[PDB]
């Protein structure tokens, strides 16, 4: 039929502001789930709930459909569902990648096509923590951030964002880039610039 479990509908109602599950709702929901906004697991949540844009409110039907399918009616249940996705974020490279690429689409401001470098950098700092499955030399990550700042790269395109994961797995160190990187491959042009910059600072 049509009625979701009362307990699930109470959860929705609890969070909404002036009839909408808005930005303030999602923040409170994350808080009550027991997370900080810095926690990558919050991206699994958004993805699980099918957010396309953070600016747009989450529809009731969408909120209810999603939890009904996870067998959740209570915060406790939802905590358990996210905890599980959080483990999968750390352990399953394919899932991490998907969530990584998804991050970009949410970071995008409305009406933009590239993300601002500062926002991008802030998110790269989250994704490249040693607990996560793509590990590289700290100096290399720092050199990348520094490059973007020093050379005036104020925006990051989807291609650059998506490709950087393969890049870092393929060359975990500055020296590996120096010794193996080929400019005539099909890397994003900004990655070619990064190589030249590193080549200079030898």
């Amino acid at each position: 039929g049509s009625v979701y479990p009362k307990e699930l509908t109470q959860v929705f109602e609890h969070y909404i502001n002036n009839n909408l599950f808005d930005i303030d709702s999602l923040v409170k929901f994350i808080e009550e789930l027991g997370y900080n906004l810095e926690d990558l697991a919050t991206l699994c949540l958004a993805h699980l709930l099918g957010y396309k844009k953070l600016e747009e409110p989450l529809k009731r039907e969408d909120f209810l459909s999603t939890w009904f399918m996870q067998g959740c009616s209570t915060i406790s249940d939802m905590q358990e569902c996210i905890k599980t996705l959080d483990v999968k974020l750390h352990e399953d490279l394919q899932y991490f990648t998907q969530i990584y690429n998804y991050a970009f689409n949410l970071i995008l401001d409305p009406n933009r096509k590239d993300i601002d470098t500062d926002e991008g950098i802030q998110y790269w700092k989250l994704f490249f923590q040693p607990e996560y499955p793509v590990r590289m030399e700290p100096d290399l990550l720092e050199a990348w951030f520094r490059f973007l700042r020093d050379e005036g790269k104020t925006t990051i395109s989807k291609d650059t964002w998506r490709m950087l994961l393969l890049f870092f797995k393929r060359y975990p160190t500055i020296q590996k880039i120096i010794s193996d990187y080929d400019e005539t491959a099909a890397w994003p042009f900004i990655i070619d610039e990064f190589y030249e910059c590193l080549q200079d600072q030898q």
């Binding site: 923040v27 906004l37 958004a46 600016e55 949410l106 926002e119 998110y123």
Partner: peptide, 12 residues
């Protein structure tokens, strides 16, 4: 969800 906090500051 850092973007979410940014959006809060913009709305406030």
């Amino acid at each position: 969800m850092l973007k979410l906090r940014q959006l809060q500051k913009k709305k406030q």
